[PDB]
């Protein structure tokens, strides 16, 4: 599935498909944008069918929620509910439109790269681990980004050998995601990415 939005500040695009023959999806998202700020996040459940699931979803509802809290503030909620379920990988990002910056949160193995008009990328590593309900040190990133920056945050469903190459050329997120097309088709597991183009 994919979904379309777009405001004066930001056009992003949402696109999910489960592994191949898998009825119950393990990834989840969530994005809301409004005329000052985005929030989104994007997450894969530990384990399989239902309890991945139950892992993914209890993050999409929670950075809907608290979604005006700092993300070190919602990945600590998220975490929490971690305790008596399978855990899931998450990444969250918010940005504020006025200021053009962002700030971002994440433990696991969702990705996020953002790439700048002048050739700099930010595309911090991968943190070891996932979120458990244990206690966490957690690393945010605030940065300021440059007016035409383009984003992807996604699961690892997503393998793509030079994401910062499709970022660059892709002139809108439409394109961008058919520029990924090759790399949905096999549907070896569920995949998930929210692309974002920044005025
Ligand atoms: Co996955």
């Known amino acids: 599935m994919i979904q379309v939005e777009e405001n004066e500040h930001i056009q992003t695009l949402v696109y999910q498909l489960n592994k191949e023959g898998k009825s119950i999806c393990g990834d989840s998202f969530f994005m809301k944008a409004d005329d000052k700020e985005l929030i989104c996040a994007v997450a894969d459940g530990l384990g399989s069918g239902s309890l991945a699931n139950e892992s993914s979803a209890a993050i999409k509802d929670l950075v809907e929620n608290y979604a005006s809290e700092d993300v070190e503030s919602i990945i600590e909620r998220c975490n929490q509910a971690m305790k008596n379920k399978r855990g899931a990988t998450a990444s969250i ?30 595309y911090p ?56 097309k090759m790399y949905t088709t096999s549907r070896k597991d569920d995949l998930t990415y929210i692309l974002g183009q920044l005025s």
Do not use: M
């Open 93 to 122: 990002l918010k940005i504020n439109f006025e200021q053009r910056q962002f700030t971002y949160c994440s433990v696991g193995n969702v990705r996020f790269i953002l790439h700048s008009p002048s050739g700099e990328s930010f």
């Open 125 to 180: 590593l991968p943190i070891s681990g996932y979120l458990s309900g244990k206690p966490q040190k957690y690393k945010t990133h605030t940065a300021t980004y440059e007016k035409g920056s383009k984003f992807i945050i996604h699961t690892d469903g997503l393998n793509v050998p030079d994401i910062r190459s499709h970022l660059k050329k892709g002139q809108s997120v439409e394109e961008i995601s058919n520029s990924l």
